[PDB]
Amino acid sequence: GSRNDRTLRRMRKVVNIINAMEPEMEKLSDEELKGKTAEFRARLEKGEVLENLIPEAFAVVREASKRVFGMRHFDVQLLGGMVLNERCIAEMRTGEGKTLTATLPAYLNALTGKGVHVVTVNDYLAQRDAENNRPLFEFLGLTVGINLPGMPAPAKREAYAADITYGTNNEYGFDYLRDNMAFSPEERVQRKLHYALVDEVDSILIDEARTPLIILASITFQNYFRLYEKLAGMTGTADTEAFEFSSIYKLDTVVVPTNRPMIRKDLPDLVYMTEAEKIQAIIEDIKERTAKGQPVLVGTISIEKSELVSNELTKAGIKHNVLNAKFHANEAAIVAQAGYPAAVTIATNMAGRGTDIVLGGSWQAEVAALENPTAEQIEKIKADWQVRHDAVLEAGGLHIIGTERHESRRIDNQLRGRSGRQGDAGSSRFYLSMEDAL
């Protein structure tokens, strides 16, 4: 309430400062910029306050980013970074740029030398992120490691050896369980847990409250993140159980504002008597908007209903797509194009979570699909796509339709978010069923 305000206003000013250092940093040469880290390390080494070089450090990361990726951190992203450095939960909507916002607090912390642990929901994302978030990090003179399941102890010492590490909550935890069952300390792959930046905190710290089972026993990984000196998370959904975050991990939730006004239209739930009445009113809806030239993603609670709705959808003569959270790699390729004017995708709970759905398709997947990277063909794609885009927009952007509400609204909010991002005009609808009286 007035608390979220005073706290946002609080650092909102520190944000203004960062923007003031922009004309300066804009001048420092590449070598002078890169070497900005040495200075920060010395400064800190001299015992200077951690949270003291935040405005200056964040100003650097923005600059490097703008130079390496050509992406200037939105001040709202800076706002988010700051929250991520305080044992807070920065809530930022889907499409807001959490992936890049983390380079900020991950850079500030990756200076002391203790390492930084960015957590993700799955292996594909963890590596994917590290992969294309690395150039910014290698520029600023840091090393990025990727921790995965089948990595021999040697490799894992490497991935945890870097200044910045990426992995999934499980593997990190599993490594910790395995390090305790270690022969000799020199056989351990981790180090003293320092800072953990959790991407999709709710998913990781709340839904993953469902114990794993050893077979016969069962344990949880709840407390694993409480062993970290610094624990911080980010998500596009947190205010729901915003109380549980502090009752366990003592994490204060800060709802960051969006960059561009959120104009997506969340339509009222239409209730039907039978499952058939539902699935039929939706295939009738997609089939409709389809012609209109508007893309539409469908969400299902489980593969179960996902399969069923898939056939009922192909039966009405409709070429759709299905993602069951099995092949993240490939699903991701597909979800990244569900923004094409004529596109229908059926995703499950954690189907293509993590891939930004650009209105009108993603031309980058188009250019990366041409052995001949010439500034000529790209133009007839970066401008060709541009057409499909504004077209899809005029057509009300992306429309998602929940086949059913989850036990937790938070969950069936993650679905909505896949739409109307970075200011995009889109819409969402939920189709409930009376027959769901179970």
Residues that bind ligand ADP (CB under 6 A): 71-74, 77, 92, 94-100, 356, 422
Query: Please, are residues 234 and 247 in contact by the beta-carbon 8 Å criterion?
Result: no
* Torsion angle defined by CA atoms of residues 152, 157, 160 and 166, in that order, rounded to the nearest 10 degrees: -10
Q: Which CB, 73 or 416, lies closer to ligand ADP? A: 73
Distance in Å, CB of 199 to Mg ion, minimum: 6
Q: Which CB, 354 or 417, lies closer to Mg ion? A: 354
Question: Which listed option, a second copy, ligand ADP, Mg ion, none, makes contact with residue 100 (CB within 5 to 8 Å by class)?
Answer: ligand ADP
CA gap 163, 103 in Å, rounded: 12
Q: Which stretch binds Mg ion (CB under 5 A): 78-86, 90-98, 157-165, 411-419?
A: 90-98
Distance in Å, CB of 171 to a second copy, minimum: 8
CA gap 420, 96 in Å, rounded: 11
Question: Which listed option, ligand ADP, Mg ion, a second copy, none, makes contact with residue 182 (CB within 5 to 8 Å by class)?
Answer: a second copy
Distance in Å, CB of 54 to a second copy, minimum: 30
Distance in Å, CB of 292 to ligand ADP, minimum: 26
- Residue 237 has what DSSP assignment? -
Token pair recorded at residue 417: 């978010």
Element (H, E) at 61: helix 54-68
Distance in Å, CB of 100 to Mg ion, minimum: 10
Residue ranges in 293-372 assigned as alpha helix (H): 303-315, 328-335, 364-367
Binding positions for a second copy, rule: CB under 8 A: 149, 170, 174, 176-178, 180-183, 212-217, 219-224, 226-227
Distance in Å, CB of 128 to ligand ADP, minimum: 10
Q: Which CB, 72 or 326, lies closer to ligand ADP? A: 72
* Torsion angle defined by CA atoms of residues 272, 275, 278 and 284, in that order, rounded to the nearest 10 degrees: -140
Question: Binding site annotation covers 356?
Answer: yes
Question: Binding site annotation covers 95?
Answer: yes
Q: Which CB, 62 or 305, lies closer to ligand ADP? A: 62
Q: Which CB, 98 or 156, lies closer to Mg ion? A: 98
Query: Please, are residues 307 and 278 in contact by the beta-carbon 8 Å criterion?
Result: no
Q: Which CB, 278 or 352, lies closer to ligand ADP? A: 352
Question: Which listed option, ligand ADP, Mg ion, a second copy, none, makes contact with residue 213 (CB within 5 to 8 Å by class)?
Answer: a second copy
Amino acid type, 346 = I
Question: Binding site annotation covers 168?
Answer: no
The beta-strand segments (E) located in 24-163 are 88-91, 116-120, 144-146
Strands 399-402 and 296-299: parallel
Binding mask 337-356 for Mg ion (x = CB under 5 A): -----------------x--
CA gap 169, 122 in Å, rounded: 8
Query: Please, are residues 63 and 24 in contact by the beta-carbon 8 Å criterion?
Result: no
Please, is 20 exposed, middle or buried when counting C-beta atoms within 10 Å of its C-beta (0-12, 13-18, 19+)? exposed
Query: Please, are residues 306 and 300 in contact by the beta-carbon 8 Å criterion?
Result: yes
Question: Binding site annotation covers 99?
Answer: yes
Distance in Å, CB of 438 to a second copy, minimum: 26
CA gap 156, 166 in Å, rounded: 11
Question: Which listed option, Mg ion, a second copy, ligand ADP, none, makes contact with residue 222 (CB within 5 to 8 Å by class)?
Answer: a second copy
Residue 278 backbone dihedrals phi, psi, to 5 degrees: -70, -75
Sign of the four-CA dihedral 239, 245, 250, 256? negative
Token pair recorded at residue 154: 């040697």
Residues 373, 374, 376: CA angle, nearest 5 degrees? 140
Q: Which CB, 199 or 275, lies closer to Mg ion? A: 199
Q: Which CB, 182 or 370, lies closer to a second copy? A: 182
Distance in Å, CB of 89 to Mg ion, minimum: 15
Would you list which residues are annotated within the binding site?
A: 77, 95-99, 356
Rule CB under 5 A: which residues touch Mg ion? 98, 354
Would you list which residues are annotated within the binding site for ATP?
A: 77, 95-99, 356
